[PDB]
Amino acid sequence: AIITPALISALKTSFQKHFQDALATAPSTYLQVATVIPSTTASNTYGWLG
Amino acid sequence: AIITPALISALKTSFQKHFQDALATAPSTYLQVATVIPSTTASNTYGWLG
Protein backbone atom coordinates (compact mmCIF):
# COMPACT_ATOMS: atom_id res chain seq x y z
CA ALA A 1 0.00 0.00 0.00
CA ILE A 2 2.66 2.50 -1.07
CA ILE A 3 1.45 6.10 -1.24
CA THR A 4 0.78 7.60 -4.66
CA PRO A 5 3.81 9.96 -4.80
CA ALA A 6 6.04 6.85 -4.78
CA LEU A 7 4.04 5.04 -7.49
CA ILE A 8 3.96 4.59 -11.29
CA SER A 9 3.90 8.39 -11.35
CA ALA A 10 7.39 9.01 -9.91
CA LEU A 11 8.95 5.99 -8.21
CA LYS A 12 8.26 3.55 -11.07
CA THR A 13 9.00 5.53 -14.23
CA SER A 14 11.90 5.84 -16.68
CA PHE A 15 12.77 9.02 -18.57
CA GLN A 16 13.21 8.77 -22.34
CA LYS A 17 14.19 11.33 -24.98
CA HIS A 18 12.74 9.76 -28.14
CA PHE A 19 10.71 12.90 -28.94
CA GLN A 20 13.76 15.18 -28.76
CA ASP A 21 14.71 17.19 -31.87
CA ALA A 22 12.49 15.03 -34.08
CA LEU A 23 10.09 17.65 -35.49
CA ALA A 24 12.29 19.44 -38.02
CA THR A 25 12.03 22.90 -39.57
CA ALA A 26 11.30 23.65 -43.21
CA PRO A 27 14.41 23.16 -45.38
CA SER A 28 16.45 26.24 -46.23
CA THR A 29 15.67 27.65 -49.67
CA TYR A 30 16.92 31.27 -49.60
CA LEU A 31 19.94 30.37 -51.75
CA GLN A 32 17.74 29.40 -54.70
CA VAL A 33 16.19 32.89 -54.75
CA ALA A 34 19.03 35.01 -53.29
CA THR A 35 22.80 35.31 -53.59
CA VAL A 36 25.25 36.03 -50.76
CA ILE A 37 27.48 39.12 -50.88
CA PRO A 38 30.09 39.72 -48.15
CA SER A 39 30.71 43.03 -46.41
CA THR A 40 33.44 44.39 -44.16
CA THR A 41 32.16 47.79 -43.00
CA ALA A 42 29.05 49.73 -42.00
CA SER A 43 27.37 49.60 -45.41
CA ASN A 44 27.81 48.59 -49.05
CA THR A 45 27.25 50.73 -52.15
CA TYR A 46 26.66 49.39 -55.67
CA GLY A 47 27.01 51.28 -58.93
CA TRP A 48 26.58 50.58 -62.65
CA LEU A 49 27.02 52.69 -65.76
CA GLY A 50 24.15 52.35 -68.24
CA ALA B 1 -16.72 -61.03 -45.25
CA ILE B 2 -19.31 -60.42 -42.53
CA ILE B 3 -18.00 -58.21 -39.73
CA THR B 4 -19.37 -55.60 -37.35
CA PRO B 5 -19.72 -52.15 -38.98
CA ALA B 6 -17.99 -50.52 -35.97
CA LEU B 7 -14.52 -52.05 -36.46
CA ILE B 8 -13.77 -52.49 -40.18
CA SER B 9 -16.14 -49.81 -41.47
CA ALA B 10 -14.47 -47.53 -38.89
CA LEU B 11 -10.81 -48.51 -39.39
CA LYS B 12 -10.89 -48.54 -43.23
CA THR B 13 -9.56 -44.99 -43.37
CA SER B 14 -6.23 -43.20 -43.84
CA PHE B 15 -5.74 -40.04 -41.79
CA GLN B 16 -3.98 -37.23 -43.67
CA LYS B 17 -2.95 -33.75 -42.56
CA HIS B 18 -3.33 -31.82 -45.82
CA PHE B 19 -5.94 -29.56 -44.21
CA GLN B 20 -3.46 -28.46 -41.53
CA ASP B 21 -2.22 -24.88 -41.94
CA ALA B 22 -4.19 -24.55 -45.19
CA LEU B 23 -4.99 -20.89 -44.50
CA ALA B 24 -2.92 -18.12 -42.90
CA THR B 25 -3.29 -14.89 -40.92
CA ALA B 26 -2.86 -11.25 -41.87
CA PRO B 27 0.84 -10.28 -42.02
CA SER B 28 2.48 -8.05 -39.45
CA THR B 29 2.07 -4.35 -40.25
CA TYR B 30 2.52 -2.35 -37.02
CA LEU B 31 6.19 -1.79 -37.89
CA GLN B 32 5.23 0.58 -40.71
CA VAL B 33 3.23 2.81 -38.33
CA ALA B 34 5.09 2.48 -35.02
CA THR B 35 8.57 2.43 -33.49
CA VAL B 36 9.70 -0.01 -30.80
CA ILE B 37 10.77 1.63 -27.53
CA PRO B 38 11.81 -0.90 -24.87
CA SER B 39 10.78 -0.21 -21.29
CA THR B 40 12.45 -1.21 -18.02
CA THR B 41 9.93 -0.09 -15.37
CA ALA B 42 6.20 0.40 -14.81
CA SER B 43 5.91 3.44 -17.09
CA ASN B 44 8.00 5.64 -19.37
CA THR B 45 8.04 9.44 -19.13
CA TYR B 46 9.00 11.43 -22.23
CA GLY B 47 10.41 14.94 -22.30
CA TRP B 48 11.67 17.18 -25.10
CA LEU B 49 12.80 20.79 -25.33
CA GLY B 50 11.04 23.53 -27.26
Author numbering:
A (entry chain B), B (entry chain C): 2 to 51
Task: Please share text taken word for word from the publication where this structure appeared.
Bacteriophage Casadabanvirus JBD30, from the order Caudoviricetes, is a temperate phage that infects the bacterium Pseudomonas aeruginosa. The virion of bacteriophage JBD30 is composed of an icosahedral capsid, long flexible non-contractile tail, and a baseplate. Using its baseplate, JBD30 attaches to Pseudomonas aeruginosa via the bacterial type IV pilus, whose subsequent retraction brings the phage to the bacterial cell surface.
Here we present the structures of the virion and empty particle of siphophage JBD30 resolved using cryo-electron microscopy. The icosahedral capsid of bacteriophage JBD30 is built from 415 copies of major capsid proteins organised in a T7 laevo lattice. The capsid of JBD30 is formed by pentamers and hexamers of major capsid proteins. Unlike in phage HK97, there are no covalent bonds linking the capsid proteins to each other. The positioning of annular loops extending from the axial domains leaves openings in the centre of hexamers (7 Å radius) and pentamers (6 Å radius). These pores were suggested to serve for water and ion passage during genome packaging and ejection, and putative scaffold protein release during capsid maturation. The empty JBD30 particle remains associated with the cell wall.
